[PDB]
Design a protein around this ligand. Structure first.
Ligand SMILES: OC[C@H]1O[C@@H](O)[C@H](O)[C@@H](O)[C@@H]1O
Length: 586
């Protein structure tokens, strides 16, 4: 009604007086007269004229014979007296490249969210996200054509599922005219792009993802106004959706309706489990504060939480605007999760340095625990990091080849144990050497031939995901100080960092990282829980083409004081590696 305007505006199928047809509604308070033109009219605007309404400003009409499948637009007389063809803002399907225009299809049946999908979005869940641009994941060999939604449901769902990810994150699949925007310069907010098939196909892709046990996070764009093809600027002749560089007018009721309404659309009518909002800073800009942007995010989040609890939202915000992932009543904004850009910048800068200069930059691996409780973090290695001459993640690493791969493997070992949910952009899991190209398939060829270093990283990421999801200690208490404790925080001259993760029932898994090529034998450190400890993950294993250094079985604790603790372990730490230890019941 007042929240889901997509249910009454646009083109919908109805039958009045007995006979069937479709009814068209468009919001335009100004503008002299408005008509519907399509395949049922010879595109003649003199035929079917619409009637405007007073206390809404909506032109409407019920055209008999006009059915699902035909194309249509609106021929209007702009409030300044101009003749302009407009596509429906609430178009559910469209046609890209060789034109622009709306379709008649109506709304899809609608999806009631199951309980396993709500459980998976929670703060106590393991959450590991595979971020993908549908247009450049893979391509057909012969001709370089895109995979359709249905082919992605048969190839991209099983892959993300086998690799052990819990979530799939899509770069924007709303209709957009150019591939170079990656989806962030949209023209139709309610239509899945037609690049990969119909909107029912997309719906089928989401069903398949649910059926495989994945949740789906969709990149959502309320921060970028349609500045293309004349799709939403000067709509009726006045600044309908825009202000008075082209930004939204979040102040108006109906505009806020068009945006909020779009959010319930994806979650209820496509079964989307979460929404991510980018450039939140670009939206809410202390002194520039756009009061109406801050309030729009707060109302969206509040309404979502009330109308579809179980679904959550995530945000990227680059100015440390306090309280991004906190309840509205204080700081506010009201997002469930926040991208940890600081950690991504810190660990990468650290990771980049010659292993030999790391002793002077230790503070880049520790500093992130100081503020881990001010926001609910996702640790993101996303698309922004591998474009525009920023190099891939693997090209950031130092040394000859084997060293770059050992470094990258150790980093993932660190990343997957650090408080925060995980996000990995496609191509990173097999260590692509080249930067991402939206125009081409990923470098899947690196994985051709006999077992190689890239298979090694790919196997690691899978074990990393599987292990991480098995042990509560690794995910239960990310956002509670009890969940993480330092064991060795100040071994700067050797670059060794050891800490513990802790589940609700007190169980500890020990994480040790060696960030230099020098292997450490008989490395002694204090523990809280004496007994028998055993490796469960070792990034230097030869299964990932490491050198296979390690502890080769159970190691018992010694009652020998160390680092202020009554008991200790003496271990091998493999070079440029991280390991995880679990305690054996006795
Ligand atoms: O089109 C398919 C092929 O395209 C190339 O650009 C990629 O590097 C290959 O890995 C891929 O398999």
């Amino acid at each position: 009604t007042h929240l889901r305007p997509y249910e009454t505006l646009g083109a919908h199928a109805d039958t009045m007086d007995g006979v069937t047809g479709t009814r068209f509604s468009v919001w335009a308070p100004n503008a002299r007269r408005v008509s519907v033109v399509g395949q049922f009219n010879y595109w003649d605007g003199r035929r079917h004229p619409m009637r405007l309404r007073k206390e809404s400003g909506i032109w409407e009409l019920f055209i008999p014979g006009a059915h699902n499948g035909q194309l249509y637009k609106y021929e209007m007389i702009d409030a300044n007296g101009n003749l302009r063809l407009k596509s429906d803002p609430y178009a559910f399907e469209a046609q890209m490249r060789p034109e622009t225009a709306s379709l008649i299809c109506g709304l899809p049946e609608k999806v009631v969210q199951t309980e396993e999908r709500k459980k998976a979005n929670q703060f106590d869940a393991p959450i590991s996200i595979y971020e993908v641009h549908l247009g450049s994941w893979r391509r057909h060999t012969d001709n370089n054509f895109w995979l359709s939604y249905r082919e992605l449901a048969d190839q991209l769902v099983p892959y993300a599922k086998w690799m052990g990810f819990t979530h799939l994150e899509l770069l924007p699949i709303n209709e957009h005219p150019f591939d170079g925007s990656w989806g962030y310069q949209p023209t139709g907010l309610y239509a899945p792009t037609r690049r990969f098939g119909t909107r029912d196909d997309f719906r089928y892709f989401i069903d398949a993802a649910h059926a495989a046990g994945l949740n789906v996070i969709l990149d959502w764009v309320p921060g970028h106004f349609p500045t293309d093809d004349f799709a939403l600027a000067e709509f009726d002749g006045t600044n309908l959706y825009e202000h008075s560089t082209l930004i939204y007018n979040y102040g108006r009721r109906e505009v806020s309706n068009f945006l909020v309404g779009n959010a319930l659309y994806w979650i209820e009518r496509f079964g989307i489990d979460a929404l991510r909002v980018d450039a939140v800073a670009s939206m809410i800009y202390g002194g520039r504060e756009n009061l109406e942007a801050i309030e729009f995010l707060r109302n969206t989040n509040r309404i979502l939480g009330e109308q579809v609890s179980g679904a959550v939202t995530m945000a990227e915000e680059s100015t440390d605007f306090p309280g991004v992932s906190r309840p509205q009543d204080m700081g506010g904004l009201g997002f469930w999760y926040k991208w940890n850009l600081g950690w991504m910048h810190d660990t990468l800068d650290y990771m980049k340095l010659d292993p030999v200069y790391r002793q002077y930059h230790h503070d880049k691996l520790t500093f992130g625990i100081l503020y881990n409780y001010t926001e609910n973090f996702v640790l993101p290695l996303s698309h922004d990091e591998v474009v525009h001459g920023k190099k891939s993640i693997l090209d950031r690493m130092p040394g000859d080849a084997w060293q770059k791969f050992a470094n990258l493997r150790a980093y993932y070992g660190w990343m997957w144990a650090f408080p925060g949910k995980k996000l990995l952009f496609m191509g990173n899991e097999f260590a692509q050497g080249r930067e991402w190209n939206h125009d081409a398939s990923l470098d899947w060829h690196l994985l051709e031939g006999g077992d190689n270093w890239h298979h090694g990283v790919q196997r690691l990421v899978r074990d990393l995901n599987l292990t991480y999801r098995h042990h509560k200690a690794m995910h239960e208490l990310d956002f509670d100080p009890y969940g993480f404790e330092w064991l060795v925080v100040d071994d700067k001259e050797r670059s060794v960092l050891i800490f513990v993760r802790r589940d609700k029932e007190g169980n500890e898994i020990i994480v040790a990282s060696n960030f230099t090529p020098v292997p450490r034998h008989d490395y002694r450190f204090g523990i809280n829980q004496p007994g028998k400890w055993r490796e469960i993950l070792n990034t230097d294993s030869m299964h990932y083409h490491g050198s296979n250094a390690g502890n080769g079985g159970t190691v018992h604790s010694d009652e020998i004081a160390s680092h202020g603790r009554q008991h200790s372990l003496s271990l091998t730490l493999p070079p440029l590696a991280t390991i995880w230890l679990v305690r054996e019941a006795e």
